[PDB]
Design a protein around this motif. Structure first.
Motif, mmCIF file in Angstrom:
data_model
loop_
_atom_site.group_PDB
_atom_site.id
_atom_site.type_symbol
_atom_site.label_atom_id
_atom_site.label_comp_id
_atom_site.label_asym_id
_atom_site.label_seq_id
_atom_site.Cartn_x
_atom_site.Cartn_y
_atom_site.Cartn_z
ATOM 1 N N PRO A 18 0.812 -1.222 0.000
ATOM 2 C CA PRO A 18 0.000 0.000 0.000
ATOM 3 C C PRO A 18 0.844 1.270 0.000
ATOM 4 C CG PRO A 18 -0.900 -1.580 1.547
ATOM 5 C CD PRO A 18 0.392 -2.163 1.053
ATOM 6 N N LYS A 19 0.537 2.190 -0.911
ATOM 7 C CA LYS A 19 1.263 3.444 -1.048
ATOM 8 C C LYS A 19 0.319 4.597 -0.746
ATOM 9 C CE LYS A 19 2.925 7.186 -3.419
ATOM 10 N NZ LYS A 19 2.185 8.385 -3.904
ATOM 11 N N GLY A 20 0.828 5.596 -0.030
ATOM 12 C CA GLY A 20 -0.022 6.693 0.378
ATOM 13 C C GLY A 20 -1.202 6.182 1.179
ATOM 14 N N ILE A 21 -2.241 6.999 1.256
ATOM 15 C CA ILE A 21 -3.475 6.648 1.943
ATOM 16 C C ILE A 21 -4.525 6.319 0.889
ATOM 17 C CG2 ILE A 21 -5.291 7.432 3.489
ATOM 18 C CD1 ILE A 21 -3.110 9.369 4.686
ATOM 19 N N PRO A 22 -4.837 5.037 0.687
ATOM 20 C CA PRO A 22 -5.815 4.681 -0.347
ATOM 21 C C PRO A 22 -7.163 5.334 -0.092
ATOM 22 C CG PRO A 22 -4.593 2.749 0.320
ATOM 23 C CD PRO A 22 -4.220 3.839 1.281
ATOM 24 N N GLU A 23 -7.819 5.729 -1.184
ATOM 25 C CA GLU A 23 -9.160 6.303 -1.147
ATOM 26 C C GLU A 23 -9.325 7.278 0.011
ATOM 27 O OE1 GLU A 23 -8.695 2.916 -0.989
ATOM 28 O OE2 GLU A 23 -9.334 2.271 1.007
ATOM 29 N N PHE A 24 -8.317 8.124 0.235
ATOM 30 C CA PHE A 24 -8.378 9.063 1.350
ATOM 31 C C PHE A 24 -9.626 9.929 1.268
ATOM 32 C CE2 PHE A 24 -6.516 11.719 4.640
ATOM 33 C CZ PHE A 24 -7.130 12.932 4.418
ATOM 34 N N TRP A 25 -9.842 10.571 0.123
ATOM 35 C CA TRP A 25 -10.956 11.501 0.009
ATOM 36 C C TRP A 25 -12.288 10.781 -0.144
ATOM 37 C CZ3 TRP A 25 -10.537 16.405 1.310
ATOM 38 C CH2 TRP A 25 -9.264 16.981 1.318
ATOM 39 N N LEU A 26 -12.299 9.584 -0.730
ATOM 40 C CA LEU A 26 -13.520 8.786 -0.718
ATOM 41 C C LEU A 26 -13.892 8.393 0.708
ATOM 42 C CD1 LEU A 26 -15.741 6.792 -1.546
ATOM 43 C CD2 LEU A 26 -13.944 5.206 -2.249
ATOM 44 N N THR A 27 -12.902 7.988 1.507
ATOM 45 C CA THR A 27 -13.165 7.687 2.910
ATOM 46 C C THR A 27 -13.670 8.921 3.643
ATOM 47 O OG1 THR A 27 -11.431 6.002 2.866
ATOM 48 C CG2 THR A 27 -12.188 6.757 5.020
ATOM 49 N N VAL A 28 -13.096 10.086 3.342
ATOM 50 C CA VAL A 28 -13.577 11.323 3.945
ATOM 51 C C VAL A 28 -15.031 11.568 3.561
ATOM 52 C CG1 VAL A 28 -13.330 13.814 3.891
ATOM 53 C CG2 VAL A 28 -11.316 12.381 4.197
ATOM 54 N N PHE A 29 -15.369 11.343 2.290
ATOM 55 C CA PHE A 29 -16.757 11.460 1.855
ATOM 56 C C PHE A 29 -17.659 10.550 2.675
ATOM 57 C CE2 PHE A 29 -15.040 12.520 -2.605
ATOM 58 C CZ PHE A 29 -14.963 13.851 -2.280
ATOM 59 N N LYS A 30 -17.248 9.297 2.854
ATOM 60 C CA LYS A 30 -18.088 8.343 3.565
ATOM 61 C C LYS A 30 -18.312 8.772 5.009
ATOM 62 C CE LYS A 30 -17.808 3.947 1.111
ATOM 63 N NZ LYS A 30 -17.198 2.589 1.112
ATOM 64 N N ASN A 31 -17.279 9.299 5.661
ATOM 65 C CA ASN A 31 -17.376 9.680 7.064
ATOM 66 C C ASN A 31 -18.030 11.039 7.269
ATOM 67 O OD1 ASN A 31 -16.043 7.300 7.422
ATOM 68 N ND2 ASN A 31 -14.226 8.174 8.405
ATOM 69 N N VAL A 32 -18.530 11.666 6.210
ATOM 70 C CA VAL A 32 -19.282 12.910 6.298
ATOM 71 C C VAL A 32 -20.683 12.628 5.775
ATOM 72 C CG1 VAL A 32 -19.457 15.307 5.534
ATOM 73 C CG2 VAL A 32 -17.226 14.314 6.045
ATOM 74 N N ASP A 33 -21.695 12.999 6.560
ATOM 75 C CA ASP A 33 -23.073 12.769 6.142
ATOM 76 C C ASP A 33 -23.389 13.528 4.860
ATOM 77 O OD1 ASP A 33 -23.615 11.071 8.288
ATOM 78 O OD2 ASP A 33 -24.208 12.734 9.591
#
Lengths: 219, 649, 223, 73
Positions: free
Chosen positions: C50-65
């Motif tokens: 794993p390189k960098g933070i995978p799906e960082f901004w997708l994960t951020v999207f998920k954790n925001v209503d």
């Protein structure tokens, strides 16, 4: 693996919060400068008020946060309020705003101008990316009003009913008891007390941002 | 007849819309609990849905003409339940199924290792799961302002979570402009300040038991699930439900011994007030027959009785000197209730807290069996049989000399201002000598001038008619500032008057148990002639004033007229047999004139009833029990008068 | 009489709102200036993300209503290649406007490297001179083009349906393209929901781009 | 006269009490034997809540009679 760089990115967010703290510091500096620029307008208000009856009393009465503190017997007092302004702390010292309430000569106290102050924050609190949604309010500075003899309203002289020991005869004793009044937050609770501190903080924030720079809209 | 009683479920129009409600107050006040507030409304505009029959409650059939009484053993509640937040309604759900929302509640009895106790207060904490997925715990005091049941959904400004303990999950940063959304997973009890009462088979343990020691605390159990009570339903999956309807079908043990199980509560109506001479099956009693049951060790248990006959059958038991067992002295039927009295000590009735005496040790009384033993639910562990023996439960004149063992001693009376007291008593005596035309008379001892003593004759057409009663009055140190200290000389071992207590106390408004410095002994005597001795003395114990015109009032008043007649005859018997050392000659003269008239009048009442009814106060449905008791006491009264030397006129 | 004085007070409040508009313009200018200080930190974030933070901004999207509701199961694989989101601001003298650059790495769905959904805010003392009202608020979006590869689109989905002919009722078993709920509709505003898109963009402006850490670790919340 | 008082911890107090004695003396003796102060206990005979201010004899207490100890709080 990933968690390590996430933690490093968190430490980075801490520096981001520090940069935002400096941002809000210069925001306060701009607030002071533009307040210097407002001074002509607020002064023109001051002379105009010389006059819109009970101007700031009505302004407070029309705001939900503030009508809660103004009691009926307070109306003869606050009505003599002549002006309200905000002063901003100079560079070097912790950010604060001082609400100054200018009162005309009265029969209730001699303070020509009464002061009250709020100190904001300018820093985070630890190595975690701690909350700072602008300059929030901690603590506050009460002050003593130069009341005339027996004209204080924060404390009421109640004729409390008591009974003699053994005899049981009833009697009235004059005792000072804490009384609710608009002036009460001028003596804020010291270091439910925390709830009252938060309420006073919010009220003062509303005074600084909403009431004073937009007093006309609230009249 | 009244047709609503406390807690009953009713349907009626509020805001113009039909709604359910609970009646809370009566002489009616109804609270439409689902959404509403208390208001007064009459029963004619209302429609009952479920009466609030609860254990210990004595009930009478609404439809059946038989006025027989009965006590309710257990109530089965089939209650409709609406899920909160949603509106799904499940019906019928039995209340025994529903569980309490919190593990313990305010004041519900509990048992520690070996102590009973009421939970005076309990500190409880909620456990919340945030939309972030974090699990935390908070004191309810802080959570009060979150805009409390398992599965709830609420919102709160971040700062509210300053003091919480973050049990699990990633701790969120608390910003004044963040609003958390929380789902309450469980409600927990943190600590509890136990107000102990009894030790159960040294010193109390700690008041606020530490949370680690709450696992041993056991509540109380019974079902009084009223409309609008939050609880948890379990699918046949805890879910928070509010009871929207109840179906009270209760088991009733009637005064005839029959147990009419599963009778709709709507067919029953409770009796707010018993005449003190009713005895439902199981009520322990002691004999009052002069000859029968000489041994104080015997007690009675009533098995059944005929209401119209005012006659009940009993079993007499006595403890075994050895061991902890009991034996049956004997069964006696046709025993008038008037010859038996509620046992001084054993008063076991359903859902009454009890403690085992020389395993489970604290419990509640479920049913007092017609046999000797009693049934106790130890917590909810099991119904068990145990004897009462080891089950603790939770005109004017101024006489000379001084009264000999009479009036008031051990007083050392000393008025702060003797002169003002003399000033008062002078006018009091003048008024008494001037305004006492109804025969009632008083006297004062020379020593301890405050020691007033009065004889009062009963009015006409009343159970106390020709009733002679002696009162001793201690005038207080600060008379007339406060009412006099009255004391009725009591010797009947009974309550001839709902206020004239056997202990010697008296009760009336003027006696402060209104008064004024202008009040005088004359006013008190007028009241005693107007209220204490009245046509229907049933109406004079701590209320019953609502009963005027109530059929229950009439029935209980007739029985009380009977009991008062028995007890006044008893009092006269004792007075003739062993009169005091004061007021004697006038007692002789009164008994000679009209004293024999009492017995003649009573015998005439009995003869007229046998033939069939005269008039004067409610006695007409003379009952087998009353006839037996009155004959048994009237022969004794005749014997006392004869041995006393009072020949018949 | 008093009406004249209150009118004078209102007109003073009008100058007040004008000076406050100048204040907020200066605030935007200082934010632009502090950008020079911010982007070193966000650039370190970019490089580490794993390189960098995978799906960082997708994960951020998920954790925001406000953003989880906008992410669809089909979208997730596509938005997984979202390299960064970062805010740029307008130059001096221009009306207050900022851009939420979604920088997106090469994929198999669409080609253009970045999506730049510019915004704008009011910069006037008030709509009506007699009245007075101010405060930074989004009064308009701009949106941007979105290309697609053959069959890789998700904003509009292709299906086979037995449609009913309009005005005749005849059955037509044919292929159709129908507008579909997708995350990338976030980049296609209604050509003058608008308020919702404005507030979501503002949220990404003041919370999720600046303080992405708090919302990725689960360390922050929004409703 | 020999009597037995049973406590809730299983112990038995053997006491010599004059029949004419008062119940307050019994409470004092129980306090001496176990420490519980008279104001803090109840005496139970065959279920009767013995009253302090009345003589034991009129409660019909006899030789080898049984008493039970309860606590009030």
């Amino acid at each position: 693996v990933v968690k390590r760089r996430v933690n490093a990115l968190k430490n980075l967010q801490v520096k981001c919060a520090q940069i935002e703290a400096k941002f809000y510091e210069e925001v306060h500096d701009l607030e002071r400068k533009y307040a210097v620029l407002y001074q002509p307008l607020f002064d023109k208000r001051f002379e105009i008020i010389n006059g819109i009856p009970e101007f700031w009393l009505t302004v407070f009465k029309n705001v939900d946060l503030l009508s809660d503190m103004v009691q009926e017997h307070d109306e003869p007092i606050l009505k003599h309020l002549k002006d309200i302004k905000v002063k901003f702390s100079d560079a070097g010292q912790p950010m604060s705003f001082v609400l100054e309430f200018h009162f005309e000569p009265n029969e209730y106290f001699t303070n020509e101008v009464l002061t009250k102050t709020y100190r904001m924050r300018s820093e985070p609190d630890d190595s975690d990316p701690f909350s700072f949604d602008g300059p929030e309010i901690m603590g506050c500075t009460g002050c003593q009003i130069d009341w005339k003899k027996g004209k204080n309203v924060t404390l009421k002289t109640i004729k409390k009913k008591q009974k003699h020991k053994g005899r049981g005869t009833v009697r009235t004793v004059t005792k000072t008891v804490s009384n609710d009044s608009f002036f009460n937050f001028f003596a804020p609770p010291e270091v439910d007390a925390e709830a009252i501190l938060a309420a006073d903080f919010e009220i003062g924030h509303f005074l600084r941002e909403r009431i004073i720079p937009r007093s006309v809209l609230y009249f | 007849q009244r047709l609503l009683f406390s807690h009953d479920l009713v349907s009626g129009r509020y805001r113009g819309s039909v709604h359910f409600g609970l009646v809370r107050l009566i002489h009616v006040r109804v609270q439409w609990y689902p959404e509403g507030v208390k208001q007064h409304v009459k029963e004619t505009k209302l429609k009952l849905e479920d009466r609030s029959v609860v254990p210990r409650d004595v009930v009478r059939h609404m439809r059946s003409t038989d006025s027989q009484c009965g006590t309710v053993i257990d109530v089965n509640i089939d209650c409709a339940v609406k899920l909160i937040g949603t509106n799904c309604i499940i019906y019928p759900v039995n209340s025994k199924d529903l569980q309490h929302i919190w593990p313990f509640m305010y004041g519900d009895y509990i048992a520690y290792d070996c102590w009973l106790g009421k939970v005076y207060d309990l500190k409880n904490q909620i456990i919340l799961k945030l939309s972030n997925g974090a699990r935390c715990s908070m004191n309810t005091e802080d959570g009060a302002k979150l805009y409390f049941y398992p599965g709830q959904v609420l919102i709160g400004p971040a700062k509210i979570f300053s003091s919480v303990q973050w049990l699990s999950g990633v701790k969120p940063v608390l910003s004044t402009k963040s609003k958390f959304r929380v789902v309450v997973e469980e409600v927990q009890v943190v600590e509890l300040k136990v107000t102990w009462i009894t030790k159960s088979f040294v010193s109390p343990p700690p008041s606020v038991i530490t949370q680690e020691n709450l696992g041993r605390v056991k509540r109380l159990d019974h079902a009084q699930r009223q409309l609008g009570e939050r609880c948890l339903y379990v699918f046949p999956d805890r879910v928070a439900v509010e009871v929207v309807t109840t179906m009270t079908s209760a088991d009733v043990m009637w005064q005839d011994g029959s147990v009419e199980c599963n009778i709709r509560s709507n067919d029953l109506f409770p009796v707010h007030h018993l005449d003190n001479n009713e005895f439902c099956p199981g009520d322990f009693v002691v004999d009052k027959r002069v000859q029968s049951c000489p041994d104080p060790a015997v007690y009675g248990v009533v098995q059944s009785g005929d209401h119209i006959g005012r006659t009940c059958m009993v079993k007499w038991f006595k403890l075994r000197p050895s061991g902890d067992d009991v034996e049956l002295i004997g069964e006696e039927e046709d025993v008038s209730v008037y010859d038996i009295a509620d046992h001084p000590d054993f008063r076991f009735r359903t859902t009454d807290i009890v403690i085992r005496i020389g395993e489970p040790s604290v419990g509640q009384v479920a049913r007092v069996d017609v046999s000797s033993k009693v049934e106790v639910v130890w917590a909810d562990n099991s119904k068990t049989i145990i004897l009462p023996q080891h089950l603790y439960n939770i005109v004017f004149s101024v006489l000379e000399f001084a009264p000999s063992n009479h009036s008031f001693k051990k007083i050392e009376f000393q008025p702060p201002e003797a002169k003002k007291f003399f000033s008062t008593v002078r006018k009091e005596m003048a008024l008494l000598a001037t305004s006492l035309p109804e025969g009632i008379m008083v006297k004062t001892f020379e020593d301890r001038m405050d020691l007033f003593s009065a004889l009062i004759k009963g009015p006409t057409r009343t159970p106390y008619e020709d009733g002679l009663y002696l009162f001793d009055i201690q005038l207080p140190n600060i008379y007339p500032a406060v009412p006099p200290h009255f004391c009725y000389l009591s010797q009947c071992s009974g309550r001839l008057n709902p206020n004239l207590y056997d202990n010697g106390k008296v009760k009336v408004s003027l006696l402060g148990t209104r008064w004024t410095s202008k009040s005088s002994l004359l006013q008190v005597l007028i009241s005693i002639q107007g209220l204490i001795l009245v046509n229907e003395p049933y109406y004079n114990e701590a209320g019953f004033d609502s009963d005027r015109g109530l059929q229950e009032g009439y029935e209980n008043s007739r029985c009380y007229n009977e009991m008062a007649l028995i007890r006044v005859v008893q009092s006269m018997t004792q007075l003739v047999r062993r009169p005091p050392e004061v007021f004697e000659q006038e007692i002789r003269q009164h008994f000679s004139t009209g004293g024999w008239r009492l017995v003649n009048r009573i015998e005439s009442w009995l003869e007229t009833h046998a033939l069939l009814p005269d008039i004067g106060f409610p006695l007409f449905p003379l009952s087998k029990g009353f006839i037996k008791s009155i004959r048994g006491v009237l022969t004794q009264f005749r014997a006392a008068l004869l041995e006393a030397g009072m020949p018949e006129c």
